């Protein structure tokens, strides 16, 4: 089998992206953020505190003749960027893209946070790391790929994310249409959880190549690129004017700049970034200052290829019985 679905950003600069999901029978369908640094499929649903839903399509278990309450099991979740969520568990149908998975845990959220509140274009998340990070307790659940890989074609699945345009999500195979030159692998530690894997380094526009090793993370779920912070201040270094504010929280940039582009390394390949990628726009309403795209990991312990560099590839999440991961330009 395979499923293909298309991925839409939620807003005009890219901050997540959104692909359909089809929940229980008849089929409830509801906009989750695909999140390849995390590794549970949870939902709004009508268990929802009330105050804390704003918009969002929820899940109703009990319109699902496929749903059934995992007894006992519960979940709790919190990212990267602070935001939280936690709830009960259903096993349900779930379909992406035409690719069905019975028996799916699908975590239904009773509280959730602002930010999640805040944003009513994302319904929920799923999870596409690997499934030793899954949060239900006290049995552990696979994600929605786990689930689906025996079933699949090819045990993969791949992110095509476009700029400012959608994009799209395939399971099970690999579209020889949709990049250009060829697909380069490299090796993936699971150590961590995640889809961690080594750049081998970095060019800042026109600059010469500085080869170094770059350990990171692959990961949908995060808007932006973090690098070390010799990393960040070569780029920025870069642009006139440019500097990092600790009131703002991060590198800011004259928005009357032009962004050079950031190269970084695939094994002996490279992929480029368009400086256009890596502006954020104001920082608030009218201001002239605009928020960089590449950013600081220090004091997040970890480097994180979010979707600002997935976005600028052909990303291949290899899920054989060895992972890897491949890059293509597109």
Known sequence: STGSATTTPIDSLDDAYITPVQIG??????????????????????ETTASEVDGQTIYTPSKSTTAKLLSGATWSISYGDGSSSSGDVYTDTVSVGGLTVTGQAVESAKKVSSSFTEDSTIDGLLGLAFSTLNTVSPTQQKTF???????????????????????????????????????TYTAVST????????????????????????????????????????????????????????????????????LPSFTFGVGSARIVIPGDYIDFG??????????????????????????????????????????????ASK
Do not use: M, R
Not at 27 to 40: K, P
Not at 156 to 177: E, K, M, R, S
């Open 145 to 183: 790929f786990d689930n689906a890989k025996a079933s699949l074609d090819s045990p993969v699945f791949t992110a095509d994310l476009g700029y400012h345009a959608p994009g799209t999500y395939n399971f099970g195979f690999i579209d020889t249409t949709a990049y250009t030159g060829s697909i």
């Open 25 to 46: 029978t008849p089929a409830q369908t509801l906009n989750l953020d695909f999140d390849t640094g995390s590794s549970d499929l949870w939902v709004f649903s009508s």
């Open 191 to 258: 150590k961590q959880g995640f889809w961690e894997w080594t750049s081998t380094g970095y060019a800042v526009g026109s600059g010469t190549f500085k080869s170094t090793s770059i350990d990171g993370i692959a990961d949908t779920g995060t808007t932006l690129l973090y690098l070390p912070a010799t990393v960040v201040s070569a780029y920025w270094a870069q642009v006139s004017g440019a500097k990092s504010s600790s009131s703002v929280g991060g590198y800011v940039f004259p928005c009357s700049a032009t």
């Open 282 to 327: 104001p920082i608030s309403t009218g201001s002239s200052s605009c928020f960089g795209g590449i950013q600081s990991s220090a004091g997040i312990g970890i480097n994180i290829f979010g979707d600002v560099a997935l976005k600028a590839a052909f990303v291949v999440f290899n899920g054989a019985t060895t992972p890897t991961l491949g890059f």
